[PDB]
Amino acid sequence: MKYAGILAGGIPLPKQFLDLDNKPILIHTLEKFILINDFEKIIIATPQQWMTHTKDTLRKFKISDERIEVIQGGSDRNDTIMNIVKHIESTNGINDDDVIVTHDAVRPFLTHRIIKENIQAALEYGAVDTVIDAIDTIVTSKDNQTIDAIPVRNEMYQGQTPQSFNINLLKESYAQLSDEQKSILSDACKIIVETNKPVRLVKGELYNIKVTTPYDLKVANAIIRGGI
Amino acid sequence: MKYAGILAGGIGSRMGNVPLPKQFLDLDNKPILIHTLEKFILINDFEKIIIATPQQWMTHTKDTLRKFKISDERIEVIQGGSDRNDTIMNIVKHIESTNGINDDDVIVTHDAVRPFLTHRIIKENIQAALEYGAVDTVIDAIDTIVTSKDNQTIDAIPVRNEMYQGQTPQSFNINLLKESYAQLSDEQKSILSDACKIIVETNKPVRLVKGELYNIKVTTPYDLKVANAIIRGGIAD
Ligand SMILES: Nc1ccn([C@@H]2O[C@H](COP(=O)(O)OP(=O)(O)OC[C@@H](O)[C@@H](O)[C@@H](O)CO)[C@@H](O)[C@H]2O)c(=O)n1
Ligand SMILES: Nc1ccn([C@@H]2O[C@H](COP(=O)(O)OP(=O)(O)OC[C@@H](O)[C@@H](O)[C@@H](O)CO)[C@@H](O)[C@H]2O)c(=O)n1
Numbered sequence: 405m406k407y408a409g410i411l412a413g414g415i416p417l418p419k420q421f422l423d424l425d426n427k428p429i430l431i432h433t434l435e436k437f438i439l440i441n442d443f444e445k446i447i448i449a450t451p452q453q454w455m456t457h458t459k460d461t462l463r464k465f466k467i468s469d470e471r472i473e474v475i476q477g478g479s480d481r482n483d484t485i486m487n488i489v490k491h492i493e494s495t496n497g498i499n500d501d502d503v504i505v506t507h508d509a510v511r512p513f514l515t516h517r518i519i520k521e522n523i524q525a526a527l528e529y530g531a532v533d534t535v536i537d538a539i540d541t542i543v544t545s546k547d548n549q550t551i552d553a554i555p556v557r558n559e560m561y562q563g564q565t566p567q568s569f570n571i572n573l574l575k576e577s578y579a580q581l582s583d584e585q586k587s588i589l590s591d592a593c594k595i596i597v598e599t600n601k602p603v604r605l606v607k608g609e610l611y612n613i614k615v616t617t618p619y620d621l622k623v624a625n626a627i628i629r630g631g632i
Numbered sequence: 633m634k635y636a637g638i639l640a641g642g643i644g645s646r647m648g649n650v651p652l653p654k655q656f657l658d659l660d661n662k663p664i665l666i667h668t669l670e671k672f673i674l675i676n677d678f679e680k681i682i683i684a685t686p687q688q689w690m691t692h693t694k695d696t697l698r699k700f701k702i703s704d705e706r707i708e709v710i711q712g713g714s715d716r717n718d719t720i721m722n723i724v725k726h727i728e729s730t731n732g733i734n735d736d737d738v739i740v741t742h743d744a745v746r747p748f749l750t751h752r753i754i755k756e757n758i759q760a761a762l763e764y765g766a767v768d769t770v771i772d773a774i775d776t777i778v779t780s781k782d783n784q785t786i787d788a789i790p791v792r793n794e795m796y797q798g799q800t801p802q803s804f805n806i807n808l809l810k811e812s813y814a815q816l817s818d819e820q821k822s823i824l825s826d827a828c829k830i831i832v833e834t835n836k837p838v839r840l841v842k843g844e845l846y847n848i849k850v851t852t853p854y855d856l857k858v859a860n861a862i863i864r865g866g867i868a869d
């Protein structure tokens with residue numbers, strides 16, 4: 405069993421529901437996952453305020469895949485992931501070989517190739533990240549004023565999503581973490597990295613952007629029009 | 633004295649059936665290099681605005697300046713270097729052999745292929761270079777940043793709050809830049825990807841100036857589609 409977890413639990417209307425070429429970003433994203441028959445369930449987690457509106461939007465764009473379920477998101481991004489996990493466990497349980505492909509609702513340009521690679525690398529190695537090589541030199545700062553270090557750019561990668569995990573592995577490593585450890589995370593693959601278990605790399609795409617600021621939405625509107 | 637070093641070097645010899653190199657390709661009917669150069673021209677603080685370019689492209693650069701009626705005597709076209717930092721040092725050697733280097737000189741280095749920098753960015757670079765001697769133009773990382781030493785598996789995922797996308801300009805006190813460059817071995821030089829790591833390898837500080845999300849580097853066709861959208865929708869306004 406392969407499960408898809410569309411993360412839309414973050415807070416005009418929230419960015420995930422904004423129109424990209426007369427169509428909510430969430431719909432753009434979800435269409436990619438619908439085309440993959442391998443998914444047992446495609447779960448959209450969203451704030452309680454926006455659950456009925458999400459289901460209205462699905463209806464409005466004539467999407468009625470019974471594989472789709474809308475559930476309530478979490479405190480933080482990782483908590484939303486864990487809510488989707490708890491939903492799967494309390495409705496059909498967790499096989500010890502099940503994987504979940506978590507993906508940002510605001511990353512509507514992921515590709516069929518990206519998803520299929522994610523699922524096969526999760527089946528093989530248990531934890532997967534979607535990245536692209538750093539184009540900018542990457543810099544670090546421990547004070548937001550002066551540089552701390554400038555690593556070898558060759559070893560730096562822009563982390564995207566999907567991020568796909570073995571559900572048992574993800575739950576066990578999340579339980580290993582403290583509340584302080586959890587609070588400093590920014591993605592889900594550091595759950596696995598912090599517990600000293602491997603994370604394979606899948607290559608994303610340069611156009612697999614996160615659409616949150618208005619600048620991003622103009623880039624996304626150009627990517628749509630120019631068929632990128 | 634404050635100097636601008638527009639980096640348009642390292643363009644390899646190319647056949648005529650390939651489009652023009654990225655620095656010279658048209659963006660809204662204007663070479664990207666000209667878009668970049670216009671911002672520096674508007675700043676009177678600069679004693680010279682030096683464009684370094686491969687030997688093959690010097691005459692074409694000067695034709696291009698003429699074509700867009702650019703006749704600022706502060707602009708000079710010189711031959712670039714073997715690598716990016718070598719191009720910077722060529723600009724330094726030009727400055728020193730034409731005006732000398734005063735100990736209060738700063739140079740504002742910038743990729744010709746980042747045409748969307750702003751007046752704000754350049755001014756902050758100049759003055760932060762005067763105060764702290766070395767400056768990087770960066771933006772807070774939006775993606776989580778990851779490291780891998782084998783292109784297969786992750787080694788580490790640092791705290792994103794401390795990670796930054798390095799952009800340009802990069803601005804230095806010229807003597808400081810020269811001294812720290814002279815300290816480096818050829819191996820160290822070969823592994824650098826920017827100019828601020830010259831200063832960082834020699835354990836001297838580098839101040840941070842915040843850039844802009846549209847201060848993108850135009851190299852791939854994808855970037856040119858993004859850059860045409862930035863132009864059309866007036867997002868650098
Ligand atoms: N309580 C919450 C908060 C947010 N969300 C969803 O999560 C998506 C991204 O959220 P956001 O746009 O704000 O970006 P983040 O700072 O969280 O980092 C992400 C970054 O790490 C990653 O894309 C990649 O880079 C790693 O490889 C959005 O769809 C939100 O709806 C959720 O479901 N519940
Ligand atoms: N012999 C050479 C080689 C390159 N150049 C110029 O350098 C510009 C960018 O070059 P390139 O697009 O190829 O990318 P780089 O690998 O050099 O990285 C840059 C990255 O570090 C920086 O933008 C930022 O991210 C860090 O803060 C281009 O205008 C080239 O003409 C030169 O004049 N002479």
